[PDB]
């Protein structure tokens, strides 16, 4: 606080008295920054200042110039800068002996000095701190307190400021810090501080590493620093070998083998957890880097150019030393644990999982004997290790080689799922879930499908830890059975389904598990509802009455929530009921889309009533309206033209939704509903379309919406033009100019996100124009005379598509939309467009290349356009 106050702390330290004295700080001292450093700069240099008082000064100093938000104290840095006619130059005389005084800790004084120095370095007008620090690293006395506090301050400075600033004297700092990196200093703590400082200085030392002269010595010192007695400098040295690996992989071929290899293998073999964990981290990072390099090499091979970064295959080179020590680590499972601390065995598991992906199919021979032999060990440790390891290697090797192992190990897994231990059952459930999720052909065999289903349905009533896996095991299995349908001749639905006999029992068991009193553990309830949605989605032609029963039950459950929706006492109530209502609405949509047309009629009334009553919600909130809008967006499509009766009550709520631009999530859903979904009303939306068009124009005027709303609005314009058809007059002049003006926007190639965003805007305008032309022309064989109003605009459309064709950063779809837009102009007029096209042959490139495009839409549209054009030019 103050010189008068700090001496009182030395005599009588307290807690309430310090807070009482701190009241005047923010009132006077913070504002009166000048002639306030002087009083704090005359106490803690004195050895008579007790630790308890110096810490109570350092804490308040650090609070005064450090904060969670930087800029509010950058203002303090600016206020401090104006005082540098005394500031930092008077405390030069103070810091030189404030260090390394009294009790053997930095007492947060070094943290205070770091504030001053990180405040100065953005201006760089007073470099003299660097000699003030480096002088006492080679000083004759070299007391451990001074050296350790100085190196700790250097670390603070390196880790606080933006890395770009400190490059002015990087070489000197690097040369100084390595002097304290030597074991020749008798003090052990100085080694700890030196190792800590180097870790944070790697950010900006790039100019030193990029030439061998210093780097060879640096690597020698760092690697020799691992052969050290103290545990803290061992772990810190390995922690400095990692994050050296990630930053400078390219140079490692001279160091990794002779030095890093043996020390890292011995580290993984270490009995103490820390060193083994650091070795696991190192060898995980090296294979992460090799995976990225393999991805880049694949990209270069696809482009045909040689790769710019050749891989050294460190992880792939050495497996016989890695796999056995890795597997043995899994045997040291903690008997009782909270499953939250990063135990070495979990790291070993994730490292082996990464190794499987990086090494691909060479991992199998090294790990197979352990899995085969220890799977039946009476020691539960080895059973857990064998089951846990087997589930990690599922990725990587192709399913052809892994198929026989799964086939001949499935009988063991089912009986392994029941075990006196709990962790064995948990890991068996995890393994079987991943097996059925990743290798569908292995789990689709009927040799053990019935025992597998029986065991799964029996385990669905078990603890949430295994139930959360049995859900998502039923999923990715039901879908695989749906895909592998015995006959799928018609596109409508598979006539028969491998799960047909058990399907109703599966649905009943899922319903019983959904409302368990422990559904919140491991998000069991949400997983169960998602699994139920996936089950209903992939239902067969058969078992429809199970869907009918599910509809009745889910409708009973949907209206049941409406009471607790009102009876709210806490935010968690809102969280839980919002999640429950969203899941209920999604399941109701997914189950309505499946039932027969006739069956939906008897439920539509109650569905719409419940939906409209729920839509009131909290008088408006993005967490509720989206679900209702999607549900209606499905009901209107499934029901068809009968929606006319419900439209009258619903439309004011739609007019609420359209104006919700503060929440773009509701806006896009409402616009989608307004589009082809509401288009099913055909020539009956005419009374309602006026306010809809007004609101859409307003959403086109207000420039606060998300960038993705505009294409949906253009698509809605096109759909409305298609729907109304012959009564777009007094409306076309209002939208044509808007889309004309919008279409000419441009953005550069600095980010390909902007490139494909512009591509979406292009295609959305293109399809809007196609819809407008189709709607104006009508389905009649003769051309309606009202189409003449768009005639003067055609040349701008051709110029716009030519401007699209000028750039070559295309993707799929735009070519098909261009073909569609060109294929109807000939039908519209047939006498003039044949001579606007030929003046600019650029579209012939799109047409001819479309014939060979890689997608059905583009091929069909380009063939149709070419047939339309060629059958009109022949008449000449």
Partner 1 sequence: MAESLRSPRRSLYKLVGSPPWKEAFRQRCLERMRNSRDRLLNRYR
Q: Which of 346, 425, 594, 762 binds partner 1 (CB under 8 A)?
A: 346
Nearest of 846, 873, 872 to residue 861 by alpha carbon: 846
Residue 815: CB atoms within 10 Å: 25
Decide whether 54 or 346 has the Cβ nearer to partner 1: 346
| Radius of gyration of the CA atoms of the chain, in A | 36
Listing DSSP states for 120-156 in one string gives: HTTT-S-TTHHHHHHGGGS-SS--HHHHHHHHHHHHH
The distance of closest approach from Cβ of residue 350 to partner 1 in the complex, given in angstroms and rounded to an integer, is 5
Cα separation values, 377 from 370, 416, 606, Å: 11, 12, 59
Total residues in contact with partner 1, by rule CB under 8 A: 36
Q: Which stretch binds partner 1 (CB under 8 A): 137-145, 485-493, 556-564, 675-683?
A: 675-683
Q: Is 288 near partner 1 (CB under 8 A)?
A: yes
Q: Which of 364, 586, 638, 783 binds partner 1 (CB under 8 A)?
A: 586
Q: Is 357 near partner 1 (CB under 8 A)?
A: yes
Decide whether 255 or 472 has the Cβ nearer to partner 1: 472
Q: What is the DSSP letter of 471?
A: T
Q: Is 474 near partner 1 (CB under 8 A)?
A: no
Decide whether 226 or 582 has the Cβ nearer to partner 1: 582
Decide whether 177 or 388 has the Cβ nearer to partner 1: 388
Q: Is 462 near partner 1 (CB under 8 A)?
A: no
Cα separation values, 48 from 9, 11, 51, 634, Å: 12, 11, 9, 79
Q: Is 820 near partner 1 (CB under 8 A)?
A: yes
Near partner 1 in 146-205, by CB under 8 A: none
Q: Which stretch binds partner 1 (CB under 8 A): 23-31, 114-122, 242-250, 343-351?
A: 343-351
| Nearest-angstrom CA–CA distance, 731 and 708 | 24
Decide whether 136 or 531 has the Cβ nearer to partner 1: 531
Cα separation values, 673 from 486, 626, 817, Å: 37, 11, 23
Near partner 1 in 227-286, by CB under 8 A: 284
838 class by beta-carbon count within 10 Å (0-12 exposed, 13-18 middle, 19+ buried): exposed
Decide whether 177 or 354 has the Cβ nearer to partner 1: 354
| Nearest-angstrom CA–CA distance, 683 and 345 | 67
Decide whether 524 or 735 has the Cβ nearer to partner 1: 524
Decide whether 439 or 630 has the Cβ nearer to partner 1: 630
Listing DSSP states for 250-289 in one string gives: GGGGGTIIIIIIHHHHHHHT-SSHHHHHHHHHHHHHHHHH
Decide whether 100 or 675 has the Cβ nearer to partner 1: 675
Q: Is 430 near partner 1 (CB under 8 A)?
A: yes
| Nearest-angstrom CA–CA distance, 613 and 629 | 13
Residue/partner pairs of 602-606 with CB below 8 Å, 24 or more apart? 603/551, 603/555, 604/635, 604/639, 604/642, 604/646, 606/555, 606/559
The distance of closest approach from Cβ of residue 709 to partner 1 in the complex, given in angstroms and rounded to an integer, is 13
* Start-to-end C-alpha separation, the chain: 98
The distance of closest approach from Cβ of residue 69 to partner 1 in the complex, given in angstroms and rounded to an integer, is 25
Q: Is 675 near partner 1 (CB under 8 A)?
A: yes
| Nearest-angstrom CA–CA distance, 233 and 226 | 7
Decide whether 39 or 786 has the Cβ nearer to partner 1: 786
Q: What is the DSSP letter of 396?
A: S
Q: Which of 30, 247, 350, 495 binds partner 1 (CB under 8 A)?
A: 350
Nearest of 585, 497, 480 to residue 533 by alpha carbon: 585
Q: Is 779 near partner 1 (CB under 8 A)?
A: yes
Decide whether 84 or 530 has the Cβ nearer to partner 1: 530
| Nearest-angstrom CA–CA distance, 292 and 711 | 35
Q: Which of 36, 249, 283, 472 binds partner 1 (CB under 8 A)?
A: 472
The distance of closest approach from Cβ of residue 733 to partner 1 in the complex, given in angstroms and rounded to an integer, is 25
| Nearest-angstrom CA–CA distance, 471 and 118 | 53
Q: Which of 263, 389, 452, 533 binds partner 1 (CB under 8 A)?
A: 533
Q: Is 660 near partner 1 (CB under 8 A)?
A: no
The distance of closest approach from Cβ of residue 75 to partner 1 in the complex, given in angstroms and rounded to an integer, is 34
Q: Is 530 near partner 1 (CB under 8 A)?
A: yes
The distance of closest approach from Cβ of residue 208 to partner 1 in the complex, given in angstroms and rounded to an integer, is 29
Q: Is 709 near partner 1 (CB under 8 A)?
A: no
Q: Which stretch binds partner 1 (CB under 8 A): 340-348, 449-457, 651-659, 741-749?
A: 340-348
Q: Is 587 near partner 1 (CB under 8 A)?
A: no
Cα separation values, 825 from 188, 776, 839, 848, 868, Å: 85, 12, 16, 18, 10
Decide whether 255 or 430 has the Cβ nearer to partner 1: 430
Q: What is the DSSP letter of 26?
A: I
CB 865 within 8 A of CB 850: yes
Decide whether 115 or 718 has the Cβ nearer to partner 1: 718
The distance of closest approach from Cβ of residue 16 to partner 1 in the complex, given in angstroms and rounded to an integer, is 40
Q: Which stretch binds partner 1 (CB under 8 A): 215-223, 227-235, 513-521, 525-533?
A: 525-533
> For tokens 């949605």, what's the residue?
533
User: Which residues contribute to the site for partner 1 (CB under 8 A)?
Assistant: 284, 288, 291, 295, 342, 346-347, 349-350, 353, 357, 430, 437, 468-469, 472, 527, 530, 533, 582, 586, 630, 633, 637, 668, 672, 675-677, 719, 722, 774, 779, 820, 857, 864
């Amino acid at each position: 606080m103050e010189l008068i106050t700090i001496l009182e702390k030395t005599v009588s330290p307290d807690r309430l008295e310090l807070e009482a004295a701190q009241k005047f700080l923010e009132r006077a001292a913070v504002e009166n920054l000048p002639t306030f450093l002087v009083e704090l700069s005359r106490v803690l240099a004195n050895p008579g200042n007790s630790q308890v008082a110096r810490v109570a000064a350092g804490l308040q100093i650090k609070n005064s110039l450090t904060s969670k938000d930087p800029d509010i104290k950058a203002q303090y840095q600016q206020r401090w800068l104006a005082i540098d006619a005394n500031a930092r130059r008077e405390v030069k005389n103070y810091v030189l002996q404030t260090l390394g005084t009294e009790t053997y800790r930095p007492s947060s004084a070094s943290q205070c000095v770091a504030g001053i120095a990180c405040a100065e370095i953005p201006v760089n007008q007073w470099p003299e701190l660097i000699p003030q620090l480096v002088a006492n690293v080679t000083n004759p006395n070299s007391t451990e307190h001074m050296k350790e506090s100085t190196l700790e301050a250097i670390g603070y400075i390196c880790q606080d400021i933006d890395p770009e600033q400190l490059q002015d004297k990087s070489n000197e700092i690097l040369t100084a810090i390595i002097q304290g990196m030597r074991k020749e200093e008798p003090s052990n703590n100085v080694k700890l501080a030196a190792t800590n400082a180097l870790l944070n200085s790697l950010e900006f030392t790039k100019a030193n590493f990029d030439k061998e002269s210093e780097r060879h010595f640096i690597m020698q010192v760092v690697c020799e620093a691992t052969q050290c007695p103290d545990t803290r400098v061992r772990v810190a040295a390995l922690q400095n070998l990692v994050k050296i690996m990630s930053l400078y992989y390219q140079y490692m071929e001279t160091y990794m083998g002779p030095a890093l290899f043996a020390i890292t293998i011995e580290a993984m073999k270490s009995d103490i957890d820390e060193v083994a964990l650091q070795g696991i981290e190192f060898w995980s990072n090296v294979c992460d880097e090799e995976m990225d390099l393999a991805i880049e090499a694949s990209e270069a091979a696809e482009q045909g150019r040689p790769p710019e970064h050749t891989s050294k295959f460190y992880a792939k080179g050495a497996l016989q030393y890695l796999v056995p020590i890795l597997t043995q680590t899994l045997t040291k499972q903690d008997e009782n644990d909270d499953d939250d601390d990063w135990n070495p065995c979990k790291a070993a598991g994730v490292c082996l999982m990464l190794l499987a992906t990086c090494c691909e199919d060479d991992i199998v021979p090294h790990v197979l004997p352990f899995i085969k032999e220890h799977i039946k060990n009476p020691d539960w440790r080895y059973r857990d290790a064998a089951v846990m390891a087997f589930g990690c290697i599922l990725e990587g090797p192709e399913p052809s080689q892994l198929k026989p192992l799964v086939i001949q190990a499935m009988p063991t897994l089912i009986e392994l799922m029941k075990d006196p231990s709990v962790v064995v059952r948990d890991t068996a459930a995890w393994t079987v879930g991943r097996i059925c999720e990743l290798l569908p052909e292995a789990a689709i065999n009927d040799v053990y499908l019935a025992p597998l289903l029986q065991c799964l349905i029996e385990g669905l009533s078990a603890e949430p830890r295994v139930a959360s896996n049995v859900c998502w095991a039923f999923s990715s299995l039901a879908e695989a059975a749906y895909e592998a349908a015995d006959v799928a001749d018609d596109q409508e639905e598979p006539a028969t389904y491998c799960l047909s006999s058990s399907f109703e029992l599966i649905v009943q068991k899922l319903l019983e598990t959904t409302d368990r009193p422990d559904g919140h553990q491991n998000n069991l309830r949400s997983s169960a509802y998602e699994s139920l949605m996936e089950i209903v989605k992939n239902s067969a032609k058969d078992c429809y009455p199970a869907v009918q029963k599910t509809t009745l039950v889910i409708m009973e459950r949907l209206q049941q929530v409406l009471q607790m929706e009102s009876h709210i006492q806490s935010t968690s109530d809102r969280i839980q009921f919002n999640d429950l209502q969203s899941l209920l609405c999604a399941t109701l949509q997914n189950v309505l889309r499946k039932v027969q047309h006739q069956d939906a009629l008897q439920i539509s009334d109650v569905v719409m009533a419940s939906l409209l009553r729920m839509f009131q919600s909290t008088a408006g909130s993005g967490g509720v309206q989206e679900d209702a809008l999607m549900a209606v967006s499905t009901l209107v499509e499934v029901l068809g033209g009968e929606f006319l009766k419900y439209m009258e009550a619903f439309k004011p709520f739609l007019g609420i939704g359209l104006k919700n631009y503060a929440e773009y999530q509701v806006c896009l859903a409402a616009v989608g509903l307004v589009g082809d979904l509401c288009r099913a009303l055909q020539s009956n939306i005419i009374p309602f379309c006026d306010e809809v068009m007004q609101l859409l124009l307003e959403n086109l005027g207000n420039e606060n919406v998300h960038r993705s709303v505009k294409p949906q609005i253009l698509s809605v314009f096109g759909d409305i033009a298609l729907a109304i058809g012959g009564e777009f007059k007094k409306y076309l002049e209002v939208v044509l100019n808007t889309l004309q003006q919008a279409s000419q926007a441009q953005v550069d190639k600095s980010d390909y996100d902007m490139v494909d965003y512009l591509n979406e805007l292009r295609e959305s305008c293109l399809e809007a124009y196609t819809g407008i032309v189709q709607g104006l022309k009508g389905d009649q064989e003769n051309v309606h005379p009202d189409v003449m109003l768009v005639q003067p605009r055609v040349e701008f459309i051709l110029s716009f598509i030519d401007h699209i064709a000028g750039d070559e950063d295309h993707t799929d779809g735009v070519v098909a939309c261009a073909a569609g837009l060109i294929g109807d102009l000939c039908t519209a007029f047939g006498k003039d467009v044949l001579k606007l096209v030929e003046a600019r042959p650029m579209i012939h490139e799109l047409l001819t290349e479309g014939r060979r495009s890689k997608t059905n839409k583009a091929k069909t549209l380009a063939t149709w356009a070419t047939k339309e054009l060629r059958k009109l030019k022949n008449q000449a």
